[PDB]
Design a protein around this ligand. Sequence first.
Ligand SMILES: CC(C)CCC[C@@H](C)[C@H]1CC[C@H]2[C@@H]3CC=C4C[C@@H](O)CC[C@]4(C)[C@H]3CC[C@]12C
Ligand SMILES: CC(C)CCC[C@@H](C)[C@H]1CC[C@H]2[C@@H]3CC=C4C[C@@H](O)CC[C@]4(C)[C@H]3CC[C@]12C
Ligand SMILES: CC(C)CCC[C@@H](C)[C@H]1CC[C@H]2[C@@H]3CC=C4C[C@@H](O)CC[C@]4(C)[C@H]3CC[C@]12C
Ligand SMILES: Nc1nc(-c2ccco2)nc2c1ccn2-c1ccncc1
Ligand SMILES: CCCCCCCC/C=C/CCCCCCCC(=O)O
Ligand SMILES: CCCCCCCC/C=C/CCCCCCCC(=O)O
Ligand SMILES: CCCCCCCC/C=C\CCCCCCCC(=O)O
Ligand code: NA
Length: 385
Amino acid sequence: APPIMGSSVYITVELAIAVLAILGNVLVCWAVWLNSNLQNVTNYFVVSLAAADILVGVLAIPFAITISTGFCAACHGCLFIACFVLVLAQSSIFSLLAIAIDRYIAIAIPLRYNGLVTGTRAAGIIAICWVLSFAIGLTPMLGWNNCGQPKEGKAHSQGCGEGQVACLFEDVVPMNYMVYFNFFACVLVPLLLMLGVYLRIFAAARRQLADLEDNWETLNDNLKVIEKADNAAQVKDALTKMRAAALDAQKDFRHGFDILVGQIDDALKLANEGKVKEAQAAAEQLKTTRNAYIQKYLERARSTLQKEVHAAKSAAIIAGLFALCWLPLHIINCFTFFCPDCSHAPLWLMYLAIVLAHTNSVVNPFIYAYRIREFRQTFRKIIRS
Ligand SMILES: CC(C)CCC[C@@H](C)[C@H]1CC[C@H]2[C@@H]3CC=C4C[C@@H](O)CC[C@]4(C)[C@H]3CC[C@]12C
Ligand SMILES: CC(C)CCC[C@@H](C)[C@H]1CC[C@H]2[C@@H]3CC=C4C[C@@H](O)CC[C@]4(C)[C@H]3CC[C@]12C
Ligand SMILES: CC(C)CCC[C@@H](C)[C@H]1CC[C@H]2[C@@H]3CC=C4C[C@@H](O)CC[C@]4(C)[C@H]3CC[C@]12C
Ligand SMILES: Nc1nc(-c2ccco2)nc2c1ccn2-c1ccncc1
Ligand SMILES: CCCCCCCC/C=C/CCCCCCCC(=O)O
Ligand SMILES: CCCCCCCC/C=C/CCCCCCCC(=O)O
Ligand SMILES: CCCCCCCC/C=C\CCCCCCCC(=O)O
Ligand code: NA
């Protein structure tokens, strides 16, 4: 069949993806620029990720369309157009890992987060990560390439000049680089590290939510212990544990905890004097403080943790969708490399895996719109105005 037919389908789909990747990701950048509620460290990595996706539309897709022709090119110029997408994928990986780490610092050490993670430090990390992405993605230009063993028969058949090759990705980029270096070391290891970080985020949230409920149950159980106590010593023992728990949870809400600790201290002083009935009556006053302050604190803390779980799930879905979209091309590369007795994956499947990898540059704006109210409302305001 005339090659122009299948190539026309591939090219049209690539151009459609390029348009959507540019539109959605420009909208993400626009939202962060205009809305100060979206201007935080986490979202500077989101913008770095959107910038890599805009460049997939502006540059990697025009380069992929050019490469699909197998046009004659100077081998090192061919390597640049073949490898530029690896720089963007590597930058995306560093941005995804930075977002996971940022979310883990936020849940594990919230009191130290604002002092540790600043916009100035994030901007430096983004700059370093872009430099490292160029070094990793363009490692073939440094000499790990097939330019020293050109396919001269293919170059002659196409009328290529001296020092030129038919510019085809698998002719110039070594598969040992694609599998061991690019895939195993630079993609799979960071994705497994991201998986580890997300597991730790969810475990930390689960433990912190369980600790909020345990402290609330302990306060209520100890009030009953005091109510059913048969002497001042049993009231004292229960108030001693309550005072320690109140101080541990204190590490309008500050006023509430001041009242709580004070009321426990009043009851404890009475219990130390052998005044069981007066100590039990003083301990009953803790219910007023629990109802007016402590319950509100517990609800607000639980709500905050639930918002962090929801935000970490949104971030993990984007990392998982990056893995889903890119794994097929990497897995095909593993078959090409490790199974030389296997027929190469057919050209239609190679085009499909490339298109799927490109589609990853369209999806993040949709995940933000569906899962993040602040993005959704800002997108609505930009589109309306
Ligand atoms: C700021 C942005 C938009 C600049 C983009 C510049 C791009 C399009 C340029 C920079 C380097 C260029 C390549 C350098 C060398 C060669 C080898 C030649 O035999 C065929 C063209 C080819 C493969 C060029 C294609 C276009 C190219 C990739
Ligand atoms: C990431 C998730 C969705 C899993 C994706 C698995 C894909 C990439 C797998 C599943 C079955 C695989 C194919 C199974 C058999 C062959 C025949 C062999 O001669 C070339 C590779 C080829 C054609 C494989 C390419 C990769 C393949 C298509
Ligand atoms: C956690 C998961 C997603 C990590 C990725 C798993 C990858 C590395 C696995 C999944 C399936 C595997 C392939 C399954 C079958 C074959 C055919 C064999 O003749 C050579 C190895 C090869 C080609 C394997 C290479 C490694 C492979 C591609
Ligand atoms: N086998 C291939 N693998 C890859 C690739 C990128 C990341 C993981 O695998 N890209 C490929 C091919 C064959 C063609 N291309 C490609 C690369 C860049 N521009 C167009 C096509
Ligand atoms: C080859 C073309 C150029 C490739 C590199 C492009 C890099 C673009 C990066 C932009 C992301 C910026 C995100 C915001 C950083 C923090 C802002 C700040 O706090 O000052
Ligand atoms: C989540 C990642 C899952 C990855 C699954 C990868 C695909 C697994 C299937 C492997 C089947 C390989 C069959 C190769 C047959 C070649 C036969 C031959 O030509 O000699
Ligand atoms: C938004 C600006 C950047 C996008 C520009 C898009 C340009 C058009 C798309 C494809 C690149 C051109 C492909 C050239 C193939 C040359 C093939 C050959 O020489 O045989
Ligand atoms: Na990306």
